[model samples]
Target: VNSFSGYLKLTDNVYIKNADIVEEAKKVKPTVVVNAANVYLKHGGGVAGALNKATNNAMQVESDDYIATNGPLKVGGSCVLSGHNLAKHCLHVVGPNVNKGEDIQLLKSAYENFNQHEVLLAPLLSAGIFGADPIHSLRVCVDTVRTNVYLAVFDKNLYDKLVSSFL
Candidate 1:
């Protein structure tokens, strides 16, 4: 039975001496340790799935589960924007059109939130959702935020490249 505690080798070490009460007793205490290993090795679909699962797990843990959108001026229908309603908050920025001023506005709004320190956790900036390419979206997001932004993607190569280039 390999439980989480077992993973840490927290079980008692049992040994016996030859008909002697002078036996050695070892007590093991459990300690929490985070493994800093790279969970995602190869990029692409596998990485994407892992990332998505992690994002969902984070949202679940924080109890912040909500969706929002942003755009240039106005498209249609009122979409949720900003705040972790489910847990804390989540901002979904939806650009009007690719290369349109709407994208900039979305960036601006996101930055505004970041400036206010609203975005405490890693913000997920998704591209190509509203017909925008990943690279373009990445540029817009990176150009907007002051601090280093974490782009949620499944592409391990892209993730490595972006992280290396920035940090």
Candidate 2:
């Protein structure tokens, strides 16, 4: 319906983005940035590492206390951290156990928690070192996050998948 940035209009609220996600993160200034966190809430490679560095390791919390409530937490359970200037907050989501149906299931739940944020920065969930199928992960995330009015930020490779989503 409306286009402000270079994103290809995927629908009205949804769009396919092909750019440096981190670069755009600074430009977009989204309210909450989402991280693909490991089970123990440790920030490792990919965007997690980037976030870890930016936050000065503030993102990692005592997983023992968190997991105690629900057995290591669900595969996609999350923790939101803040005190960074890039955005108001950062939501750390548990890593993928396996690509099987669980990645999307977990992502659906992960994306749900951010529905209230108007602008959001999210890399293609679990698509980095964990080797999630890029198209599958983005597709699942798009449909799941679409109902809310937040703008999702992503990179080029995944943007190709989003562009072809209609094809």
Candidate 3:
């Protein structure tokens, strides 16, 4: 659970474990760019960052400022799920309680809407939303979205099988 609210500068090649919108934005530079996957938030954090920079650094400055400002940052409300705070526009899929058929349907809908060049970011599993284990949850998500899926997980090791399956 990462909560970012201000500007940050990374001197090294940093691997963010779990970062909020503000923390991710600080890493962006004129030449160096960063990409995030499976991160959680209300709206796309990257977009918020750009909007912040474009509007004289207003978006995630302080809780009070965020609440008081009537700018583009306030255009969208808080992010409730992961991937909502990315720089790029993203398609967010909310699955059913773990292991439910509705989860597959949601993934199918997302894939149908996906563009060829667009990247799909989703979690390893539902995090046991309905008392399911990680493996089962991941399997359901992977199997359903296999054709049009790009697995995004905090644990890269968990992605080995999913990658091999697609390849």
Candidate 4:
């Protein structure tokens, strides 16, 4: 299958790439894939669902258990889950819905709270059903990345914009 790809050097350690996160997640070692999740960490649809499905629903069980023990994840909060076939672990970060207030702050906090790993595969959190502006979301995603990151974005326009901004 055809997949779009672009790269930019954000820092000595942080590199940004516009590619398919799920595809990249499986290719790395000791990696943590980020799931742009709702507060409940339900793998119903979108990026979370895709990642869970990629792992054959193994992650959903872990998510359920986490919620049962710790309650729902708050906005800007995060927790790790089994990655199964995708990676070593998955970081489920609850993003803010832009329609509500404090979107940027919450999103930034979510990014900041996550511990940097060898490789991070992340979708554009809050840019989907959460209704955050894609541009703003992408900026935050790039700004807070602590290590190598795959900014998986399906929209070609956004991908081109990311590449053009640097290249």
Query: What is the C-alpha local distance difference test score of each model?
Result: 0.29, 0.60, 0.31, 0.73
Each candidate's number of clashing pairs is 13, 0, 14, 0
Using alpha carbons, what is the TM-score of model 2? 0.72
Better of 2 and 3 by TM-score: 2
Per-residue lDDT over 20-134 for candidate 1, one digit per residue giving the tens place of the 0 to 100 score: 0000000111111101111111112222223224444453232222222222223211122222222123332223334343443454444333333322222223333333444
Model 2 lDDT tens row, 1-167: 22226766555555555655456556766667677777666566677777666656655443334556555445767776672655677766665746444544566676565555555666767676756766676666667665433334445555665566553
- Candidate 4 Cα outliers beyond 4 Å, as residue runs: 1-6, 99-102, 116-118, 165-167
Candidate 1, lDDT over the whole model: 0.29
Q: Highest lDDT, which number?
A: 4
The lDDT-based order of candidates, best leading, equals: 4, 2, 3, 1
Error (Å) of candidate 4 at residue 162 is: 2.7
**lDDT per residue (tens digit) for residues 89-117 in model 3:** 33332333333433433333332332332
Tens-place lDDT per residue, model 4, 54-96, is 8888788888888899999889988887878887788888889
Q: Rank the candidates by TM-score, best first.
A: 4, 2, 1, 3
| Alpha-carbon TM-score of each model against the true structure | 0.35, 0.72, 0.33, 0.83
